[PDB]
Amino acid sequence: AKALIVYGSTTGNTEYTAETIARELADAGYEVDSRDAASVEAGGLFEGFDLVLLGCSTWGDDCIELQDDFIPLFDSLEETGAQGRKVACFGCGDSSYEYFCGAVDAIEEKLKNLGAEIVQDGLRIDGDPRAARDDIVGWAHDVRGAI
Amino acid sequence: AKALIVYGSTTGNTEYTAETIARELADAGYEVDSRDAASVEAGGLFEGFDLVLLGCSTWGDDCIELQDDFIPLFDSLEETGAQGRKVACFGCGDSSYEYFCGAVDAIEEKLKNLGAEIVQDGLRIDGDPRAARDDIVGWAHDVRGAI
Numbered sequence: 086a087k088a089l090i091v092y093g094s095t096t097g098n099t100e101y102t103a104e105t106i107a108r109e110l111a112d113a114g115y116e117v118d119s120r121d122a123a124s125v126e127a128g129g130l131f132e133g134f135d136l137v138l139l140g141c142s143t144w145g146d147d148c149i150e151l152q153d154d155f156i157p158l159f160d161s162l163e164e165t166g167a168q169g170r171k172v173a174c175f176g177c178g179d180s181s182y183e184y185f186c187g188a189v190d191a192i193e194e195k196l197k198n199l200g201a202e203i204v205q206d207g208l209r210i211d212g213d214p215r216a217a218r219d220d221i222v223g224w225a226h227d228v229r230g231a232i
Numbered sequence: 233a234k235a236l237i238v239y240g241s242t243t244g245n246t247e248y249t250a251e252t253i254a255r256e257l258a259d260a261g262y263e264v265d266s267r268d269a270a271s272v273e274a275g276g277l278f279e280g281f282d283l284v285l286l287g288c289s290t291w292g293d294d295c296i297e298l299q300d301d302f303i304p305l306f307d308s309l310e311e312t313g314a315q316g317r318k319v320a321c322f323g324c325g326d327s328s329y330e331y332f333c334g335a336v337d338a339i340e341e342k343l344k345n346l347g348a349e350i351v352q353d354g355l356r357i358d359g360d361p362r363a364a365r366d367d368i369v370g371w372a373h374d375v376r377g378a379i
């Protein structure tokens with residue numbers, strides 16, 4: 086099975102989360118393509134993957150702001166190949182702000198509006214993801230299991 | 233049963249939606265207190281209500297922005313009495329923007345983080361709510377039915 090993990094990450098927490106997820110999937114035998122959102126183009130990005138995991142941190146005080154590298158992928162998600170695609174989202178955030186991991190809900194609602202098949206409720210990490218390693222690995226285990 | 237509907241609405245669509253919802257509930261025998269978000273204080277706002285319906289439009293282009301009259305209630309939802317409270321959210325929005333009715337998800341996730349009991353998936357209206365009257369009434373019917 087081939088999986089694509091695409092992450093927007095500014096201070097490296099969602100990137101560390103993606104790497105942990107990539108390792109859990111690769112350990113399970115997936116072929117994993119892990120890409121920073123800054124580097125991708127949306128047109129056709131999900132073509133050929135059996136699973137796509139989108140990871141994105143959240144910013145802003147009074148408006149939910151997605152991580153900036155992710156915003157163009159998000160703005161063009163309708164061109165990514167999501168119809169019928171198995172996907173799940175994850176994101177790092179901080180419960181001391183007003184909208185906890187709001188980027189995760191935003192991306193999930195857009196993938197649903199676009200026909201994606203969300204396979205596990207998103208992983209919303211508060212704080213340093215290095216402290217939520219079991220959650221992250223556990224989540225990756227559940228995603229795989231839900232395929 | 234007493235219900236409280238609190239709405240943030242700028243161009244009147246979520247207000248018209250609240251009024252339609254209030255009428256459906258009152259027709260069913262609820263006592264309905266319908267309040268504009270601009271007028272309320274958060275401290276203790278849900279005390280004594282059997283059902284609370286929060287309505288809020290969405291603004292911003294690249295950041296999800298809740299309707300401004302609603303933002304202080306949202307920022308203080310932990311002081312409203314939500315623990316264990318039956319609630320449901322609704323909001324007007326427009327699918328030509330990037331984050332469709334993102335304020336509805338935001339408020340739902342916060343009411344969940346705070347112990348509320350969300351009783352029906354939120355009503356996210358695209359376009360003029362006067363065109364989605366059956367949906368709105370239908371939704372109010374379902375909320376009541378889920379109590």
Ligand SMILES: Cc1cc2nc3c(=O)[nH]c(=O)nc-3n(C[C@H](O)[C@H](O)[C@H](O)COP(=O)(O)O)c2cc1C
Nearest residue numbers: 094095096097098099142144145178179182185186
């Ligand atoms: C100005 C600012 C605003 C933020 N806003 C939010 C927010 O609204 N919601 C949230 O969950 N986290 C918010 N955060 C927390 C970051 O999402 C958090 O630091 C996360 O670990 C960043 O992940 P990243 O390194 O992958 O970019 C904010 C941080 C800053 C500095």
Ligand SMILES: Cc1cc2nc3c(=O)[nH]c(=O)nc-3n(C[C@H](O)[C@H](O)[C@H](O)COP(=O)(O)O)c2cc1C
Nearest residue numbers: 241242243244245246289291292325326329332333
């Ligand atoms: C600058 C601007 C930004 C908007 N952004 C969003 C948005 O991000 N998401 C959305 O669903 N609707 C968005 N809208 C649409 C309004 O939510 C829509 O007009 C709705 O009917 C307003 O409800 P209200 O009259 O209750 O305030 C936006 C409208 C404007 C003018």
